[PDB]
Paper text:
The host cell protein cyclophilin A (CypA) binds directly to the HIV-1 capsid and modulates capsid uncoating and viral infectivity. Binding of CypA to the CypA-binding loop of the viral capsid is essential for viral infectivity, as substitutions in loop residues G89 or P90 in HIV-1 CA are deleterious to replication.
To elucidate the molecular interactions between CypA and the HIV-1 capsid, we determined the structure of CypA in complex with an HIV-1 CA tubular assembly at 8-Å resolution by cryoEM. The density map, combined with structure-guided molecular dynamics (MD) simulations, unexpectedly revealed a novel, non-canonical, second capsid-binding site on CypA that is vital for stabilizing the viral capsid. First, among the three CA helical arrays in the assembly (dashed black arrows denote the three directions along which helical tubular arrays are formed, each direction corresponding to a different curvature), CypA binds preferentially along the most highly curved array. The interaction at the second, non-canonical CypA-binding site is weaker than at the canonical binding site, as shown from pair interaction energies −16.1±7.3 and −28.9±17.0 kcal mol−1, respectively, obtained from unrestrained CypA simulations (simulation 4—Supplementary Table 1). We conclude, therefore, that CypA likely employs both binding sites to strengthen the CA dimer interface in the CA assembly, thereby stabilizing the viral capsid. These seemingly contradictory observations can be explained by steric hindrance between two CypA molecules upon simultaneous binding to neighbouring CA hexamers, thus weakening, at high concentration, the dimer assembly interface.
Numbering used by the authors:
A (entry chain C): 1 to 164
B (entry chain A), C (entry chain B): 1 to 218
Amino acid sequence: VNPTVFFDIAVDGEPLGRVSFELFADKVPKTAENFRALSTGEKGFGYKGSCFHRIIPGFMCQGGDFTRHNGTGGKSIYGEKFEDENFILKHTGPGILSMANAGPNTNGSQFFICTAKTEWLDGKHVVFGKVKEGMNIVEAMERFGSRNGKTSKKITIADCGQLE
Amino acid sequence: PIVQNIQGQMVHQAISPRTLNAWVKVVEEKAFSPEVIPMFSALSEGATPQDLNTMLNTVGGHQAAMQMLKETINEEAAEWDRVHPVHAGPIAPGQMREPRGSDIAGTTSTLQEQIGWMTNNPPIPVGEIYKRWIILGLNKIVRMYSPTSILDIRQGPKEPFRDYVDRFYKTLRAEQASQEVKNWMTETLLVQNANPDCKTILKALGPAATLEEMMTAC
Amino acid sequence: PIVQNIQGQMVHQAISPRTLNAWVKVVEEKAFSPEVIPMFSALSEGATPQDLNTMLNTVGGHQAAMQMLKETINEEAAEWDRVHPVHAGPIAPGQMREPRGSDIAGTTSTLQEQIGWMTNNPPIPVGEIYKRWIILGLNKIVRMYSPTSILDIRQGPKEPFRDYVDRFYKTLRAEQASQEVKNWMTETLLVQNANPDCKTILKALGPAATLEEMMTAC
């Protein structure tokens, strides 16, 4: 058992709705454990009030840079980056959650949320969970992206944690 | 390279063997003289990293020189990587990644990627950046083999002022000193290392003579 | 080692010096005689992989042999891991992670973990199974240190049968043959590689005699 984690999504201040996630902790334990603990902020840091800095229609929505806010920041709960844990789970279609990285062994806290089937990401980004509820709020999120990733609204994780 | 207009259509083809014969020849003929450098530049117009590597690989001579150079290039490749972080997360369709030090070296990249970077709008000139990282190592290899110190350039007893100037300027070429330090040297050190009988004539044209007024005499 | 005399589960003690001086000494003065195996077993009773490693490493002499014994362990440890699938997600409440080839040889597992699986119900007996791998090694090693080979043993004409059975037994003990074969070797092979005058008396005596009688023939 891994408890389901959520993000609350606000846009420009105004709430947009809630996203829920299920994480594959039995296949991928410290990667799943990382996005779960950064969701609570139990370690005195994590995803709360950090903007989604890269949003691209019909590909993915990316966040979890909570330090720079730009796509060069983020850090794991273990400190610095971690090794690619297990590449078993395929990017099988929308609502897949998977780890944004800059090449080998760089998984910090950043992630991206698939809104298309992205088969070429298999073996390069660990798939570590899957969308439980709130996928159409990530459809509402994508609308505020552009083709290069440039967001045209400030899109902010209002609140985050875990669910009994 | 890119061929028939770098701002045209962006047609591409391989580094000519006719370029390569002329390139192997000139290091054979001319050593690590600073004359092989603009020769390198004029051969390398619109060249990819894959093309530049073939220039180095084909030479077969000069293997300590080439090694010392490839070591110097890897230090500049390392600086590029160090200065530039890559922005994290996956490449979108139609789009391309930010180039690292070994990408421009051509070792963790392919031609398909190199052409992408080079022919994007606006163009990212990875060829040029890596041609400069070569030339920066060539300058050092040139200087290593360089004729002996400029500060020790002193006109001989059976030597004309023209040959002295010749020799002075030839040493000034393979010197990598500032063009300010070189000017002041052309002005001061030239004369004060000159031979007495020539120095007298040189001084007697007074301060701030043109090289031609000097060469006309002496 | 683990302490016998505590009724509670798994109370333990830092390894005796006397145990280790005696292991080194039997390795020094017995030279891998087959006698080393029950001896090593009196010493290694109640012990852990940390302690069996501490024992293995303690021997400074004999370093070829020691490298052979470790090659046995790793082959068994490769076999152990080849056979088993081994679970990689979080363990469920009240239960523990199941021990790999490295965990039983004591290279990834620590003393606390070694203790955990013997605590448990079913216990997994990782000191026994590692000692099994060590005894399987030493059983190869003793054969190898023994010059004689069982078919090459044949009685001289003038050789007493007590003396001949002594060396037969010594050679047989060291060999690594199946029981049924050994029974046949002790029944027909022994008497057939006897000397004919002796074998003529042994046959006359017959097979219905005691071994006590058979030793006092010839």
